[PDB]
Amino acid sequence: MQLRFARLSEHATAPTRGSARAAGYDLYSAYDYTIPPMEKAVVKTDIQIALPSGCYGRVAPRSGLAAKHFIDVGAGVIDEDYRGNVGVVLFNFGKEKFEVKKGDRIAQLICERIFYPEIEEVQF
Amino acid sequence: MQLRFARLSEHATAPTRGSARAAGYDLYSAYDYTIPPMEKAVVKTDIQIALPSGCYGRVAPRSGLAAKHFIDVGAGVIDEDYRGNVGVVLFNFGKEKFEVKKGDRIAQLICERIFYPEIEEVQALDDTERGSGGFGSTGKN
Amino acid sequence: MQLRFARLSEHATAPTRRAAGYDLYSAYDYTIPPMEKAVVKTDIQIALPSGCYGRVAPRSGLAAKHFIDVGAGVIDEDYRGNVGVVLFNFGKEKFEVKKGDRIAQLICERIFYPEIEEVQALDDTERGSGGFGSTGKN
Ligand SMILES: O=c1ccn([C@H]2C[C@H](O)[C@@H](COP(=O)(O)NP(=O)(O)OP(=O)(O)O)O2)c(=O)[nH]1
Ligand SMILES: O=c1ccn([C@H]2C[C@H](O)[C@@H](COP(=O)(O)NP(=O)(O)OP(=O)(O)O)O2)c(=O)[nH]1
Ligand SMILES: O=c1ccn([C@H]2C[C@H](O)[C@@H](COP(=O)(O)NP(=O)(O)OP(=O)(O)O)O2)c(=O)[nH]1
Ligand SMILES: [Cl-]
Ligand SMILES: [Mg+2]
Numbered sequence: 314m315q316l317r318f319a320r321l322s323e324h325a326t327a328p329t330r331g332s333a334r335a336a337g338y339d340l341y342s343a344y345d346y347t348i349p350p351m352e353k354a355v356v357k358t359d360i361q362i363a364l365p366s367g368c369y370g371r372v373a374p375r376s377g378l379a380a381k382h383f384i385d386v387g388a389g390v391i392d393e394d395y396r397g398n399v400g401v402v403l404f405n406f407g408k409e410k411f412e413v414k415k416g417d418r419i420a421q422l423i424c425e426r427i428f429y430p431e432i433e434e435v436q437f
Numbered sequence: 438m439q440l441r442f443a444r445l446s447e448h449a450t451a452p453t454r455g456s457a458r459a460a461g462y463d464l465y466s467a468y469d470y471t472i473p474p475m476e477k478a479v480v481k482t483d484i485q486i487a488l489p490s491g492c493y494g495r496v497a498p499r500s501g502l503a504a505k506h507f508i509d510v511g512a513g514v515i516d517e518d519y520r521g522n523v524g525v526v527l528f529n530f531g532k533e534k535f536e537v538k539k540g541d542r543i544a545q546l547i548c549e550r551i552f553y554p555e556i557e558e559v560q561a562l563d564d565t566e567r568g569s570g571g572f573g574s575t576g577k578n
Numbered sequence: 579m580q581l582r583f584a585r586l587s588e589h590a591t592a593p594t595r596r597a598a599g600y601d602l603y604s605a606y607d608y609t610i611p612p613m614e615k616a617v618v619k620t621d622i623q624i625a626l627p628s629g630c631y632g633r634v635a636p637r638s639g640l641a642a643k644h645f646i647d648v649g650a651g652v653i654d655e656d657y658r659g660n661v662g663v664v665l666f667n668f669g670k671e672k673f674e675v676k677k678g679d680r681i682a683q684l685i686c687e688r689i690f691y692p693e694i695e696e697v698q699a700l701d702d703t704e705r706g707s708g709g710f711g712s713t714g715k716n
C-alpha cells in the first residue's frame with residue numbers, strides 16, 4: 314500500500330528508491346555531522362513516517378558506505394506506531410573520520426513484513 | 438498468530454511489547470553480565486521459543502542502548518526449528534564497560550515473515566534494470 | 579517459491595540450508611585483520627522470488643566465537659551481479675576465511691513495495707514520539 318511521511322523541517326528530503334525494485338527507501342540527512350573514528354551519531358531525517366499495517370521499517374546500511382568507509386547502522390527498528398523523527402544510528406568503524414552533509418543518503422528503509430503474535434507460556 | 442515459549446529456569450522473564458504495535462518483544466537477560474569495551478557476550482534469556490510458521494525470530498538491537506551506550510546485537514537468526522536457550526549476542530563497541538543486570542531488556546525479538554524457497558541452479562541469469570549495479574553505484578546524494 | 583542462482587565461476591558452491599537462511603560459501607581465501615572488513619565474493623548471482631529481498635545475515639557461531647559480523651546486507655530482487663558478503667572483523671585476531679567456508683546466510687525477507695506519499699501531518703499514536711529507551715530498562 315502506502316508509505317506516508319511528513320517533513321518536520323525544510324532540511325528533510327523524501328525517501329527515494331535507488332531503482333524500481335530496490336528493497337530500501339534511501340534516507341537522507343537533514344544536517345551536517347562530523348562523526349569521529351570508532352564513534353556513533355544519531356543522524357536525523359527530520360521526517361516522521363506512517364508504515365503500512367503488518368510491517369515495520371528497518372533501517373539498514375548501504376553497501377557502498379559499509380564496504381568503502383566501514384559504516385554500519387545500529388538500532389534500526391522503526392515501529393508502525395512511531396510518529397517521531399526518524400533517526401539513523403550510524404557507526405563509524407575503522408580509521409579516518411566520517412563526514413555527513415545535509416542531503417546525504419546515509420541509510421535505507423525497508424518495510425519488513427512481520428507478525429504481531431500473542432505470546433503464550435507453556436510447560437551455534 | 439501465536440508465539441509459544443517455555444521458561445528454562447526461574448531466572449527467565451516473559452518477553453513483553455514496549456508499545457501497542459511494537460515490532461519486537463523485548464528479551465530480558467536472565468543473568469548479570471559485564472561486557473568490557475570492544476568485546477562481546479552471549480546473554481542467556483533462559484527461554485525456548487516455538488515461532489509460528491512462515492517466520493523466523495530476528496534478535497534485534499534496542500535503540501536507546503545503541504544510541505546511548507554503543508551496544509549492538511550480532512548473529513540474530515532464531516530458526517523456527519530451534520528449541521534451545523535463546524541467546525543474545527551483544528557487542529559492546531563503546532569505550533565503556535557495559536553492565537547487564539538480570540531483568541534488563543537488552544534486545545527485542547521480531548517475527549520476520551520469510552519465504553522458504555527451493556534453490557535451483559540455472560545456467561545464466563537474465564539482465565535487469567539494476568544489473569550488476571551495486572556498492573554505492575547510485576551515489577551519495 | 580523458487581530461488582534461482584547461477585555460478586559466476588568454478589569456485590562457487592551452491593548455498594545450503596526449517597533454517598531461515600541458506601548458508602553462503604566464500605569463493606576465495608581471505609585474511610581479515612583485527613578491526614577491519616572485507617567484501618567476500620560468493621561468485622553466485624541470484625534471482626530472488628517476488629515480494630522479497632535477500633538479506634545477508636551473520637552466522638551465530640562466527641559471531642559468538644570470533645566476533646564476526648555482516649555489514650550492508652541488502653540484496654535487491656533486481657540485482658544480477660556477484661553476491662558479496664561484507665564481513666566485519668571486530669575481534670582482536672585476524673580471521674582466516676578459506677574458500678568453501680560458510681561465512682554468512684541468505685534470508686528471503688518478505689517485504690512490501692509501498693508507494694511513498696507526502697502528507698501535511700500524520701495520524702497520532704499512543705507511542706507518539708516515544709523512542710530511544712522511552713519504555714525504560716527493565
Ligand atoms: O534506528 C532507530 C531505531 C528506533 N527509533 C525510534 C523509532 C522506534 O519506533 C522507537 C523505538 O525503537 P526500539 O523499540 O527499537 N528502541 P527502544 O526499545 O530503546 O525504545 P523504546 O523504549 O521507546 O521502545 O525508537 C529510531 O528513530 N531509529
Ligand atoms: O543471536 C542468535 C543467533 C542464533 N542463535 C541460535 C538459534 C539458531 O536457531 C541457531 C543457529 O543460528 P545460525 O544458523 O544463525 N548460526 P550458525 O550457522 O553458526 O549455527 P548452526 O550451524 O547450528 O546453524 O543458533 C541464538 O540463540 N541467538
Ligand atoms: O551486502 C551486500 C549489499 C549489497 N550488495 C549488492 C546487491 C545490492 O542489490 C547492491 C546495492 O545494495 P544496497 O542498495 O544495499 N547498497 P548501496 O545502496 O550503496 O548500492 P547502490 O547505490 O548501487 O544502490 O549491491 C551485495 O552484494 N552485498
Ligand atoms: Cl511508522
Ligand atoms: Mg541502494
Ligand SMILES: [Mg+2]
Pocket residue numbers: 455459499713
Ligand atoms: Mg522498544
Ligand SMILES: [Mg+2]
Pocket residue numbers: 597637
Ligand atoms: Mg546455521
Ligand SMILES: [Mg+2]
Pocket residue numbers: 385386647648649
Ligand atoms: Mg549489524
